[PDB]
Design a protein around this ligand. Sequence first.
Ligand code: XYP
Ligand code: XYP
Ligand code: XYP
Ligand code: FE2
Length: 287
Amino acid sequence: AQVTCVWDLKATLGEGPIWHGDTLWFVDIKQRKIHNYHPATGERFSFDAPDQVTFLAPIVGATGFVVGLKTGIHRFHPATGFSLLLEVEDAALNNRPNDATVDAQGRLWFGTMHDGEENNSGSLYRMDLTGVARMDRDICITNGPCVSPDGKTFYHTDTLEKTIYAFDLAEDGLLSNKRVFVQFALGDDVYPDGSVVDSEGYLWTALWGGFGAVRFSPQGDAVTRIELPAPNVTKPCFGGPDLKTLYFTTARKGLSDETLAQYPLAGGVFAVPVDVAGQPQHEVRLV
Ligand SMILES: O[C@@H]1[C@@H](O)[C@H](O)OC[C@H]1O
Ligand SMILES: O[C@@H]1[C@@H](O)[C@H](O)OC[C@H]1O
Ligand SMILES: O[C@@H]1[C@@H](O)[C@H](O)OC[C@H]1O
Ligand SMILES: [Fe+2]
């Protein structure tokens, strides 16, 4: 259908969109901002973060959000700012968190990455009521943790290796039976960024350098591709009254001034109606 640039925000690294409280929340990692977009009114709110902020997740029985800062996992509320919840990694790695999801058990799955985007020092983490467990390792840029509606399949992306993996997800939160789900052969400079799983179990993957997003069947076959006037698309997010408005964050990061003049809406927020609803956002169980 028609794609609308609903917020010509020109973010440096728009990322981590979630639908919460009937509005769209997301981040600009590199401008260190949390953004909030109210589609019903067009109202926009922005909050400064004391470090790069990479993901947002709401909390069971509590206000505010748990967020990924470069310095660790924090609680955030607009009224009180940021407070450290826990550190996950040696700061010496020059890592930062990146993408995250909340599964149906209130577990927060989030990745880390080399902030310099060169070292294979990133990991996957599972944060729940039993603590924080390292689930995978040795990945330069992690991305797009997500779970299927039935809770039995978990997807995770190695962006620079152009590969999405699928795992069996057990009821105690353990992973097994890792296998290639999709390896990207869509162009020299096209990499999978963030992904979400829709209500039918199909995977939507935003394309870095691919000017859009691709919907994949549970068997790993592309069924639909959405074009946006922005070379780097970072993550999809289902929102709107019935989770049938697919929002996308995008990024100006990595694009030359010439390319930005050619694609000036890069870094904007885009919305397109789709036929299959997304999954409802889950809240993290912190205690
Ligand atoms: O600009 C990028 C910077 O933000 C990142 O930290 O390191 C890689 C650079 O390309
Ligand atoms: O650093 C960026 C990361 O945050 C994004 O998820 O994938 C693209 C990278 O350039
Ligand atoms: O080769 C891959 C193909 O199998 C998948 O369906 O679409 C993505 C391609 O990269
Ligand atoms: Fe990402």
